[PDB]
Amino acid sequence: YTPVVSHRFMASFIFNRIPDPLDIRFQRISGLSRELQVTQYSEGGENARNNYLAEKIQHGTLTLERGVMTVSPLTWMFDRVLSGEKIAYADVVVMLLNENSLPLSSWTLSNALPVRWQTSDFDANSNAILVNTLELRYQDMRWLGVKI
């Protein structure tokens, strides 16, 4: 039918089956890619058409940046795991939104491990928002709804 636009979205986190509804305001989210790795096997007298053998599926890496805000249960989670205290998992629910703020489709990203966390640079010469480019690696992705 008709396509949808890419500037309404919210992403909520699930810290140990306890939802986190304070941290849904993000600047951008990376867009979710998955890829089936493929080993090409060429053989014998068949030298006019390829022959591709499937392999394991390689999921992408989810980056999402936000303006730096007051400290929140999202920020206390990344600071806990990137200071070497506790390696813990967090589930991410990324959903599109309608005009009536209803979800079109949602991606649930099970057991996403927070990998890196990077702020923007200070500079005195230009005016811009300090952002928090924080990037986390998920190990499964289960698309759910209508209008994928």
Partner: protein, 148 residues
């Protein structure tokens, strides 16, 4: 000594008398301008020298139609206010040069699916004798020109 029936079939028609029909309403505007049918061109030249020219993609259409404000009537704003995130109630515009009283149409322009952008509120200044005039710049597609 030409008669008034040869003037109505030979002489050209002037701009200063037209009616506009927005959807199912009739709103009296002051100046409608900017409707056209444009195409881009594709050139291909090769070797021995053949300068092939083909018309390519149809180019976009945004018309600009202008109206003084009235003390009770607020019609153009509730069309530019009706837009939430992704969709407007798209209407169709018919412009038509008329007779003196609107009993006849002489040539008609039809605009297919029109949604508004860029409503310009009037320019106030205490040194001008103008009428408070606002304009609306609605983007659309498929302007066709229909006789009678």
């Amino acid at each position: 000594s030409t008669s008034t029936s040869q003037i109505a079939v030979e002489y050209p028609i002037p701009v200063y008398r037209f009616i506009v029909s927005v959807g199912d309403e009739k709103i009296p505007f002051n100046s409608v301008s900017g409707l056209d049918i444009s195409y881009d061109t594709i050139e291909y030249r090769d070797g021995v020298g053949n300068w092939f020219k083909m018309p390519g993609q149809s180019q976009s259409t945004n018309i600009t139609l202008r109206k003084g404000v009235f003390p009770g009537k607020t019609e153009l704003f509730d069309w530019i206010n009706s837009i939430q995130l992704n969709q407007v109630e798209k209407k169709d515009i018919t412009i038509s040069l008329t007779n003196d009283a609107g009993t006849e149409l002489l040539m008609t322009w039809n605009v297919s699916n029109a949604f508004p952008t860029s409503l310009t509120s009037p320019s106030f200044d205490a040194t001008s004798n103008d009428i408070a005039v606002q304009e609306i710049t609605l983007m659309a597609d498929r302007v066709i020109m229909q006789a009678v």
